[PDB]
Amino acid sequence: RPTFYRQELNKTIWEVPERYQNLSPVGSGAYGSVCAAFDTKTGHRVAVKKLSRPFQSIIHAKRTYRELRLLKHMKHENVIGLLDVFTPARSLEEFNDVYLVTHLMGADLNNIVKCQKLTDDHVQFLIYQILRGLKYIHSADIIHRDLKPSNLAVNEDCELKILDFGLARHTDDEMTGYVATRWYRAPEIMLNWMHYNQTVDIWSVGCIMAELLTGRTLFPGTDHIDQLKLILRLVGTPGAELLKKISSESARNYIQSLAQMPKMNFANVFIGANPLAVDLLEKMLVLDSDKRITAAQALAHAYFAQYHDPDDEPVADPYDQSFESRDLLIDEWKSLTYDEVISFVPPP
Ligand SMILES: CCc1cc2c(=O)[nH]cnc2s1
Numbered sequence: 481r482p483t484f485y486r487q488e489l490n491k492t493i494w495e496v497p498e499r500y501q502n503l504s505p506v507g508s509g510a511y512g513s514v515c516a517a518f519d520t521k522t523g524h525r526v527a528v529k530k531l532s533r534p535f536q537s538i539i540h541a542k543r544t545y546r547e548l549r550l551l552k553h554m555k556h557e558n559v560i561g562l563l564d565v566f567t568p569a570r571s572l573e574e575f576n577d578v579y580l581v582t583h584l585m586g587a588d589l590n591n592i593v594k595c596q597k598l599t600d601d602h603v604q605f606l607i608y609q610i611l612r613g614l615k616y617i618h619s620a621d622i623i624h625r626d627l628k629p630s631n632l633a634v635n636e637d638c639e640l641k642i643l644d645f646g647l648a649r650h651t652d653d654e655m656t657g658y659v660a661t662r663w664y665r666a667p668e669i670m671l672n673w674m675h676y677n678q679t680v681d682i683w684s685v686g687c688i689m690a691e692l693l694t695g696r697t698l699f700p701g702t703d704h705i706d707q708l709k710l711i712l713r714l715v716g717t718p719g720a721e722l723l724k725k726i727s728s729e730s731a732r733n734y735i736q737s738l739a740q741m742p743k744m745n746f747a748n749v750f751i752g753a754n755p756l757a758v759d760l761l762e763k764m765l766v767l768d769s770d771k772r773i774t775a776a777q778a779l780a781h782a783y784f785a786q787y788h789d790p791d792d793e794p795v796a797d798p799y800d801q802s803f804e805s806r807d808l809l810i811d812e813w814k815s816l817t818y819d820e821v822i823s824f825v826p827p828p
Pocket residue numbers: 667668673674718725726727728731767768769770
């Protein structure tokens with residue numbers, strides 16, 4: 481067990497191994513507080529996250545276990561990995577606090593898509609890396625659920641990592657009105673007309689790719705209904721074949737009240753874009769979810785000819801998510817989490 485030291489940073493006690501030096505606050509959502517630090521064992525600049533109220537309720541204890549399981553599994557160049565996890569507790573009986581350690585991320589996509597000029601070669605490389613990471617994630621039967629520019633880290637060399645997996649945490653208020661939290665979501669999960677499926681993530685990649693090509697949000701709706709009208713104007717209203725599969729009686733009722741619209745000509749929407757970029761957008765932004773291109777199929781598209789290497793696009797180890805259907809007490813979720821903290825093995 482390492483030696484730990486204590487300090488107060490913005491009204492919060494931080495108890496951390498001596499290896500982590502020069503802690504300085506960087507931010508705090510409702511999920512916890514984050515400090516930047518220098519890791520003397522590895523030489524990396526790291527983010528240290530102290531979870532807030534990790535075991536306060538059954539829902540919160542299960543969410544803590546879910547986040548730790550997911551971060552311990554992810555081992556891929558285009559996905560955030562776990563550098564360390566620790567607790568100052570010396571036993572289960574005194575266990576209260578969990579700290580998670582990752583590489584410190586500077587810029588997100590947002591920063592480079594708003595405030596920089598992107599060639600077609602930059603769009604090819606950035607979308608290639610998102611799809612390489614998503615092939616790995618989907619091969620473990622994981623759905624990200626929250627892909628958007630603020631959840632994509634990018635460095636000076638245009639190298640990309642996916643972060644901030646959906647933990648099923650986003651609230652109704654967070655999704656209300658003129659908000660980027662909703663503009664990348666697939667239409668079938670916008671108003672919960674279908675259960676989540678890995679196919680919702682490819683819709684999000686299409687929205688991100690369109691915004692890198694134009695410099696503008698693709699579907700900047702002022703509310704859920706405005707957003708659905710912008711979506712159906714581009715991709716068309718649901719045709720005979722898709723209507724048959726719309727099992728939500730609420731969806732058929734509102735959708736059949738709208739005048740029918742044909743799919744638009746993407747070459748006239750994305751004026752001047754690479755024709756191979758236009759073709760790939762038409763394969764991602766399909767209203768019928770089962771007809772969308774998959775991550776594995778998209779990596780083989782001719783738009784990525786410069787980068788595609790089928791011997792360097794790895795799949796994941798199997799991921800057991802049977803805990804998701806399990807009914808446990810707060811202290812049982814807390815013991816499962818404790819076991820995962822003490823069994824952590826650091827990366828090479
Ligand atoms: C209008 C959005 C929808 C797409 C979709 C699908 O792919 N299957 C079933 N229901 C829906 S609603």
